Amino acid sequence: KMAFPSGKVEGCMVQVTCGTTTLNGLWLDDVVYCPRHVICTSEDMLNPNYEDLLIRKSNHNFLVQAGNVQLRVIGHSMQNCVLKLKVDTANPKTPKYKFVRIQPGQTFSVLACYNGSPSGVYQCAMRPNFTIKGSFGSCGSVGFNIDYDCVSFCYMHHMELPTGVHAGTDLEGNFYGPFVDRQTAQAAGTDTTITVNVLAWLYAAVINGDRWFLNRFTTTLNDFNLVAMKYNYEPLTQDHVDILGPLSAQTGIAVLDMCASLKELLQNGMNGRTILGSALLEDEFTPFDVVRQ
Amino acid sequence: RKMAFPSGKVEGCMVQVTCGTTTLNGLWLDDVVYCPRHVICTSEDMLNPNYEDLLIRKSNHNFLVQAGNVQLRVIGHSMQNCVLKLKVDTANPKTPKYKFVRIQPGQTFSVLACYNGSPSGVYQCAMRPNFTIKSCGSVGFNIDYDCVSFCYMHHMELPTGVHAGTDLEGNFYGPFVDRQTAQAAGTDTTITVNVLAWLYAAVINGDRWFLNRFTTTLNDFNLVAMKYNYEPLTQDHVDILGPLSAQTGIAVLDMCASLKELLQNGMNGRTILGSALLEDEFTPFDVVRQ
Ligand SMILES: CN(C)c1ccc(O)c2c1C[C@H]1C[C@H]3[C@H](N(C)C)C(O)=C(C(N)=O)C(=O)[C@@]3(O)C(O)=C1C2=O
C-alpha cells in the first residue's frame, strides 16, 4: 500500500502563525489556505466565534513562513472552516491542481507536517464514519491524489478526536462528517470495514495468482449483506457492485461469487496463510487503486 | 500509521537509463547517474553474464539517460560492484545534501517506486532478517534534517514475490546475485527488537492490558521466542531499548516477560494499538520519532 510521491505538495507547505498558535498552510498561487482555528488560543477552542475573532484581525496579525522567507499577507477571507490568506508572492512551485470532495471509502495520501515542516507521508482512507486513523501540531496537513501531474486536494486536517482519530474538511472548508472546529466532546460513531475495498483487494489477489480462498458457492446480495453486517462490514450496494464490474470482467469471477469467498473468509479466518502477503484483510484499497496498479 | 519520509528530495534525482533492450531507473547525483549494472544485459545475457566483457564493449553513446524532458550527455562510465556509474556533463541542480550508508537487517527505510524514470509511489519497509524487502533502480532512503541517506537500490525480483538489492556502493544485501538463476528466499523471522519497541509504543500510549508482573532472563526468553520463529535478542538490541525503558519505567527483561506471555497465551481477542497482530517494522528509533 503506497502513497503518492509527495514532492509536488511539499513545495506548497508553509508555516502560519497568529500570536500564540502555529499550523501548516497550503500555499497555492498567491493564496495560503489553512484551518481557521489558527486564530484560536487553546482556551478559545471551547466556544469560538470565528466571525468575531476574524474582524478583529489585520494582515499584519498573520505570520506566514515559507522555509525562512517570510511572506507578506495583503488580504484575508474565510470560507466555512478554512482561512484564506492572500500573499503578495505567487508560489513558484505551484503544481497544476484541483479541489475535490471525496466519498467515504476513497483513498488518498496525507503529508504530515509539523510547524510547516514536512515530516512524513501515508496512504489512508476516508473511514465510513468520516474519520482518518492517522498519526498526528499536524493541523493543516493535507490529503491528496495525483492524476499524471494534476494534484487533487481532498482533505485538510483540523481536529484530533478523543477516540484518537482525526477529522477534517475538504478544501472548501466543509467538514467530512458531522464534526465542528470546536473542542467539545464529539462522538466518532462506530466504524465499519469498507466492504467494496476488501472485495477489490481480493480481486487483486486473484489477478496476482492467489486462488486459495475461492469457493464453489455464490450468494444473493441480501444474504451477503446480512452475514457481513454481523462482522461489522458496510452494506454493499448495487453501485459498489458496478464498480467491481471492471475487475469481475478481468478475472471472470462474478461479484456475488467473490462475495461468497468473503463470506467464508470471515467465517474461517486465514489458517496461517496470507493474501497478497498479508495475514489481515485490507480495506484501504479501492477498486480504482487496483485498476491503477 | 507507519509513515514514509517525504519523497520530494529523491524525486528530483530520478532519471531513466537505457542501454539497448533494457530501461530502468537511475539516481542522478551531482554529475553522476547511478543505476543497476544489469541494465547492460539483454534478457539473453542474464543467464551467465560477464559484466567486465559487456562493459568494455560499451561506449558513452550506447547509454541513453533521460531526465524528464532533457537527454543528458554521458562522458564516462565505470562500474562499482553491482552498480553502474555514468558521468554526465551536467551536475543535477536538484541535488540534495546526501550520504550513502549501509543498513543492518531490522532497520527501516522509505522506498520510492519508479517506472521508467517516473515516480509512482512511496512506502515504508524494513530490511527483513533474510535481507529481502516485501521497478529496478528504485531507491530506498532515510532523511535526517535535510540529509538524505541512500541505503538501497532495487535489482532483483525473487520468485517468492519479494525484492533484493544493493547499497549504493553496489554491494548486495544478503547472498543474492545479479544473474537470472533461481534464488532461494531463505525463511524469514520476526524482528524481535522492533516488536519490543512497538510494545513500548503501546504502553506510552494507552494500551496497558498486556503488562505483567513476572520477569525473565535473556536466555529463557530467547529459547521461548526462537520457538515461535523470532530473532535472537542481543545486548545491543537491549541497549537501544534503554532509551524507551527509561521513559516508561519498564525494565527491558520485564517487557520481555510481557512478550513471552503474548506468544504463549495469545491476545484473548484483545488488540494492541488497535491491531490484532504484532508489528515488527518499527525500530526503537522509529518509535522515538513517533
Ligand atoms: C475469524 N474468526 C475465526 C471468526 C469466525 C466466526 C465468526 O462468527 C467470527 C470470527 C471472528 C470475529 C471477529 C470480529 C470482527 N472482525 C474484526 C472483522 C469485528 O470487527 C467485530 C466487531 N463487533 O467489531 C466482531 O464482532 C467479531 O468479533 C466477529 O463478529 C467475529 C465473528 O463473528
As a whole number of angstroms, the distance between CA B276 and CA B130 comes to: 25
Pairing mode, strands B139-144 and B147-157: antiparallel
**Cβ of B5 and A133 within 8 Å?**
no
CB B38 within 8 A of CB B166: no
Count of CB atoms situated within 10 Å of the CB of B211: 16
Q: Which residues line ligand 1 (CB under 6 A)?
A: A 231-232, 267, 269
Burial of B268 (0-12, 13-18, 19+ CB in 10 A): exposed
CB B185 within 8 A of CB B162: yes
As a whole number of angstroms, the distance between CA A111 and CA A28 comes to: 16
Pairing mode, strands A73-79 and A82-87: antiparallel
As a whole number of angstroms, the distance between CA B290 and CA B283 comes to: 11
The vertex-B196 CA angle with A117 and B131, nearest 5°, equals: 80
CB A114 within 8 A of CB A161: no
**Cβ of A121 and B121 within 8 Å?**
no
User: Which residue, chain included where needed, has cell 509511489?
Assistant: B121
**Cβ of A10 and B8 within 8 Å?**
yes
User: Which residue, chain included where needed, has cell 507578506?
Assistant: A72
CB B215 within 8 A of CB B251: yes
As a whole number of angstroms, the distance between CA A222 and CA A205 comes to: 25
Burial of B172 (0-12, 13-18, 19+ CB in 10 A): middle
- DSSP letter at A39? G
**Cβ of A3 and B122 within 8 Å?**
yes
Dmax over CA atoms of chain B, in Å, equals: 69
**Residue B200 CA: distances (Å) to CA of A216, B127, B226, B244, B259:** 45, 21, 21, 7, 11
- Which residue's alpha carbon is at the smallest distance from atom 6 of ligand 1? A267
CB A85 within 8 A of CB A28: no
Edge-to-edge, what's the strand order for the sheet holding B14-19? B70-72, B64-67, B14-19, B22-29, B32-36, B83-88, B74-80
Q: Which residue of A has its CA nearest to B274?
A: A133
- φ/ψ of A50, rounded to 5, equals -70, -35
As a whole number of angstroms, the distance between CA A262 and CA A242 comes to: 17
User: Which residue, chain included where needed, has cell 542522478?
Assistant: B28
- Mutational pocket test of ligand 1: of A232, A234, A275, the residue with most ligand atoms within 8 Å of the beta carbon: A232
H or E stretch including A244?
helix A238-251
Pairing mode, strands A69-71 and A82-87: unpaired
Q: Could you tell me which residues come within 8 angstroms of residue A101 by beta carbon, excluding any fewer than 6 positions away? A: A154, A170, A172, A174
- Catalytic, A37? Answer yes
As a whole number of angstroms, the distance between CA A247 and CA A288 comes to: 10
The angstrom resolution of this structure is 2.7
Which domains does chain B show, CATH number per domain?
A: 8-166 (2.40.10.10), 192-289 (1.10.1840.10)
**Cβ of B6 and A7 within 8 Å?**
yes
B interface with A, Cβ–Cβ < 8 A, is 1-9, 11-12, 112-113, 119-123, 134, 161-162, 206, 274, 276-277, 290
- Catalytic, B237? Answer no
As a whole number of angstroms, the distance between CA A202 and CA A29 comes to: 42
Amino acid at B42: T
- Which residue's alpha carbon is at the smallest distance from atom 25 of ligand 1? A231
- How many interface pairs between A and B have CB atoms less than 8 angstroms apart? 68
Q: What letters, b where the CB count within 10 A reaches 16 and e where it falls short, cover A43-59?
A: ebeeebebeebeeeeee
Q: For CA atoms B277, B280, B284, B290, give the dihedral sign.
A: negative
Closest CA to A97 of A59, A154, A48: A154
As a whole number of angstroms, the distance between CA B48 and CA B165 comes to: 19
Q: Could you tell me which residues come within 8 angstroms of residue B274 by beta carbon, excluding any fewer than 6 positions away? A: A133, A164
Q: Which residue of A has its CA nearest to B2?
A: A122
Q: How far is A26 from chain B (nearest CA, A)?
A: 16
Strands (E), B4-52: 14-19, 22-29, 32-36
Helix axes A255-268, A221-228, angle to 10 degrees: 30
Q: How far is B42 from chain A (nearest CA, A)?
A: 26
Burial of A232 (0-12, 13-18, 19+ CB in 10 A): exposed
Q: What's the half-sphere exposure (Cβ side, CA atoms, 13 Å) at A124?
A: 28
CB A38 within 8 A of CB A18: yes
CB B25 within 8 A of CB B15: yes
Q: What technique was this entry resolved by?
A: X-ray
**Cβ of A279 and B274 within 8 Å?**
no
How distant is the alpha carbon of residue B14 from its chain centre?
A: 18
User: Which residue, chain included where needed, has cell 489481515?
Assistant: A280
- Mutational pocket test of ligand 1: of A266, A271, A273, A283, the residue with most ligand atoms within 8 Å of the beta carbon: A266
Q: Pick from B7, B161, B162: which is nearest to A6 by CB?
A: B7
The span from the first CA to the last CA of chain B, in angstroms, equals 10
**HEC letters along B139-206:** EEEEEECCEEEEEEEEEEECCCCCEEEECCCCCECCCCCCCCCCCCCCCCCECHHHHHHHHHHHHCCC
Q: Which residue of B has its CA nearest to A276?
A: B161
Three-class SS of residue A38? Answer: helix
Q: For CA atoms A148, A149, A150, A151, give the dihedral sign.
A: positive
As a whole number of angstroms, the distance between CA B26 and CA B17 comes to: 6
Q: How far is A135 from chain B (nearest CA, A)?
A: 6
Amino acid at A21: T
Q: What letters, b where the CB count within 10 A reaches 16 and e where it falls short, cover A176-204?
A: bbebebbbeebebeebbbbbbbbbbbbbb
Closest CA to B149 of B84, B98, B208, B77: B98
As a whole number of angstroms, the distance between CA B287 and CA B290 comes to: 5
Q: After which residues is chain B broken (C to N over 2.5 A)?
A: 134
The ligand 1 atom at the shortest distance from the C-alpha of residue A231 is 30
A-chain residues near B9 (CB < 8 A): 7
As a whole number of angstroms, the distance between CA A249 and CA A236 comes to: 19
As a whole number of angstroms, the distance between CA A77 and CA B75 comes to: 55
Q: Which residue of B has its CA nearest to A7?
A: B8
Three-class SS of residue A113? Answer: strand
As a whole number of angstroms, the distance between CA B151 and CA B140 comes to: 6
CB B16 within 8 A of CB B114: no
Pairing mode, strands B32-36 and B83-88: antiparallel
Burial of B264 (0-12, 13-18, 19+ CB in 10 A): exposed
As a whole number of angstroms, the distance between CA B111 and CA B7 comes to: 8
Pairing mode, strands B139-144 and B108-115: antiparallel
Distance A85 CA to ligand 1 centre (A): 48
Catalytic residue among B41, B114, B136, B256: B136
